[PDB]
């Protein structure tokens, strides 16, 4: 889907397999966090289905012993001063010494500020001990979390459930067309892109000689010249688009290890899975009731959230016994209005706009001339796009194709995809929802200077789910967007005593970094909110509490109370409503039983299981159940009669006997049992069909074939 899911598919520990456990018969003690996982396996990232606890992710600093055990680095402390030697330990040794906590107050000389410290004992128990018998310390915080989890700002303010949800949802975002970098984030974005391998990195220092949209030619310092080719609009494994764009000029000088070209979800070397949007937190007319989201119409006009999806089709040229199937443009007796695109070989041309039902490659079959039938590849229902490229493999050119086939054709179709109702959005803190409405720009709440907001979130889901990292991210995002400058005329204020230099002033659209377990304390945020640069006019839109005065787009009257406004990072998940809508009135039927097929690739019906039958029997509806179970599903003579009755406008006839009952009777007889259906007075009923009217009325295919003229 994106580089992060690829980097996380490896570095993955599975408990299932040959010689391991069973998915259903696992238990409840093997799905638990053991006190020996600190630093070796992440306790947050795991599936939330029936695989919970049986799959995990390796930590960041961990490494594997030659024997097969996992080690972590610890920094050795001698005689109360924290040294700088690093030693790798396994759980066996780790459960023997006393190991301190990651964020202890070292006093720039190695001695602890406070005598009491939290440590972990032999049995994994935590306790408060005087700082005299410790002999190890953690190398850094974030050493207990995985690589997907270390990319959440303000992680310590979120409960375990929502943190797990956000870490799992970060791997489903699709690559957009622009992919701008986050305004507020952690420092793990840069190393998660280079190591995944989606970007081009120069191997040796030199001066770039030539730049284009396809290749980059680099002239080294010893006369050697190296040219890098780039992949443009290539299909991924899941249908998304993989692209690479240069980010260097024609005279710049590069260095060994510098990023030269971007990738799918990369911006200037950093991972960028979403967009920055202006957010107000308030209920609004019930359109965001129960986790729904309200969007603006500017995100549709300006292609803020738009993605390219590519699909592939294929055909085979077989050697049928009665002849040999061939690819040609002589489809039996078809109007030439449909052969307009197929040039001469029967293969569609590049750039044509296809629709549902059209022809991609024309093929014929020998019936056993006067035997040519039409079996050509056609676009299935619900597809469109522009043909991007055709790849043809032939037997007469040494190409190794399997015996029986002699010509392969592969046609790629691509389409752009905008945002709409039903598409799923999510954030990094566990918020997720579908889009309930898209409003015009002219009727969204707007600030004092007339800037509309971009997305409205409800306020009833924030406190009872215990994920308040989003409001803090909102405040810090607004502060980073508008900039700040601390007035340090008389010394430095008390609350900014710990802030480093270069962080007391920031220009608009700055980018800041908040590591996972040591970042901006709440006092610093409260202080920064009170000193923010004004807009182009001498105005401040957001006061000291993080709230603003909004007008109403429909009535014009200002809202009576101020509302929380900020900037939030929103990503577009890969659950699109364009691939989830299905309907069917009549289609293909199965073979052993005459029930309708199942699935979406073929026209498939919806299952009506046991629980729905129980509900219908509780309602007392006896005719609806009988009509659902006989004429709509299985009664082979009743279906055509019902269709004729509906078309002619007459009454629906009576049902018959489903074929599954007869199949069951045949099985029971074949198991050497004597099953009989009797009448009121013996005389077992024959139950052996009868002479019906074979004349196919209405002269129409029931629907197994759509329509051939």
């Amino acid at each position: 889907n994106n580089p992060l899911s690829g980097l996380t598919h490896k570095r993955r520990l599975s408990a299932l397999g040959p010689g391991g456990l069973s998915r259903e018969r696992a238990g409840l003690e093997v799905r638990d966090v053991h006190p020996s996982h600190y630093g070796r396996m992440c306790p947050i990232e795991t599936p939330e289905g029936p695989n919970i606890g049986l799959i995990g992710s390796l930590s960041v600093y961990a490494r594997v012993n030659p024997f097969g055990f996992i080690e972590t680095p610890y920094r050795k402390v001698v005689d109360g001063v924290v040294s700088d030697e690093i030693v790798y330990l396994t759980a066996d040794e780790e459960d023997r010494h006393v190991v301190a906590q990651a964020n202890s107050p070292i006093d720039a000389d190695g001695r602890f500020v406070e005598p009491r410290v939290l440590v972990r004992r032999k049995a994994g128990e935590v306790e408060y001990v005087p700082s005299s018998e410790v002999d190890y310390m953690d190398v850094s915080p974030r050493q207990m979390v995985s690589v997907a989890t270390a990319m959440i700002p303000f992680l310590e303010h979120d409960d375990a459930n929502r943190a797990l949800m956000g870490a799992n949802m970060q791997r489903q975002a699709v690559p957009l067309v622009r992919s701008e970098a986050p305004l507020v984030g952690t420092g793990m974005e840069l190393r998660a892109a280079i190591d995944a391998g989606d970007v081009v990195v120069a191997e040796e220092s030199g001066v770039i000689e030539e730049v284009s949209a396809d290749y980059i030619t680099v002239m080294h310092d010893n006369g050697t010249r190296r040219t890098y080719r780039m992949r443009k609009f290539a299909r991924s494994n899941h249908g998304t688009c993989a692209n690479q764009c240069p980010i260097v000029d024609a005279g710049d000088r590069v260095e060994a290890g510098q990023v030269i070209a971007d990738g799918p979800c990369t911006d200037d070397g950093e991972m960028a899975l979403g967009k920055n949007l202006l957010v107000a937190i308030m209920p609004w007319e019930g359109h965001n009731y129960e986790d729904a989201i309200i969007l603006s119409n500017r995100l549709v006009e300006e292609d803020v959230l738009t993605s390219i999806h590519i699909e592939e089709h294929e055909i085979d040229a077989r050697d049928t016994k009665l002849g040999a199937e061939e690819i040609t443009r002589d489809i039996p007796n078809i109007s030439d209005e449909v052969l307009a695109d197929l040039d001469e070989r029967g293969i569609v041309r590049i750039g044509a706009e296809v629709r549902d039902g059209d022809i991609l490659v024309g093929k014929v079959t020998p019936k056993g001339a006067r035997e040519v039938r039409d079996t050509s590849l056609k676009v299935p229902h619900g597809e469109s796009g522009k043909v991007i490229g055709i790849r043809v493999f032939s037997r007469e050119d040494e190409d190794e194709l399997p015996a029986g086939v002699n010509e392969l054709v592969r046609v790629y179709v691509a389409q752009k995809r905008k945002i709409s109702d039903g598409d799923k959005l999510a954030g990094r803190h566990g918020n997720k929802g579908v889009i309930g409405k898209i409003l015009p720009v002219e009727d969204m709440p707007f600030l004092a200077d007339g800037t509309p907001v971009d997305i409205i979130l409800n306020t009833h889901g924030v406190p009872r789910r215990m994920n308040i990292g989003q409001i803090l991210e909102t405040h810090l995002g607004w502060c980073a967007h508008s900039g700040w400058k601390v007035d340090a005329a008389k010394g430095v204020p008390d609350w900014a005593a710990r802030l480093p230099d270069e962080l007391l002033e920031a220009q608009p659209n700055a980018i800041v970094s908040t590591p996972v377990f040591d970042g901006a304390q709440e006092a610093e945020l409260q202080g920064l909110l009170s000193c923010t640069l004004p807009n182009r006019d001498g105005d401040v839109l957001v006061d000291a509490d993080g709230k603003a005065m909004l007008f109403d787009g429909r009535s014009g009257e200002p809202f009576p109370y101020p509302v929380t406004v900020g900037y939030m990072y929103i990503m577009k998940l890969h659950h699109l409503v364009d691939d989830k809508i299905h309907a069917r009135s009549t289609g293909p039927y199965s073979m052993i039983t005459q029930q309708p097929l199942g699935g979406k690739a073929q026209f498939g019906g919806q299952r009506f299981g046991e629980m729905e039958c129980w509900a219908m029997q509780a309602y007392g509806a006896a005719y609806t159940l009988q009509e659902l179970l006989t004429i709509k599903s299985d009664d082979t003579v009743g279906r055509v009669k019902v269709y004729e009755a509906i078309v002619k406008g007459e009454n629906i006839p009576e049902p018959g006997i489903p074929e599954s009952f007869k199949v069951l009777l045949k099985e029971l007889q074949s198991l050497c049992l004597n099953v009989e259906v009797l009448s009121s007075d013996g005389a077992a009923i024959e139950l052996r069909e009868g002479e019906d009217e074979d004349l196919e009325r209405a002269a129409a295919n029931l629907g197994i074939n759509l329509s051939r003229n």
């Binding site: 690093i86 190398v139 590069v254 802030l499 270069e502 970094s513 590591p515």
Partner: peptide, 21 residues
């Protein structure tokens, strides 16, 4: 740092890391 052309992103962190990823 330690990346020849990384974009500048100032951090709020107070601790010092002795070991790199």
């Amino acid at each position: 740092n330690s990346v020849p052309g990384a974009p500048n992103r100032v951090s709020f962190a107070k601790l010092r890391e002795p070991l790199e990823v």
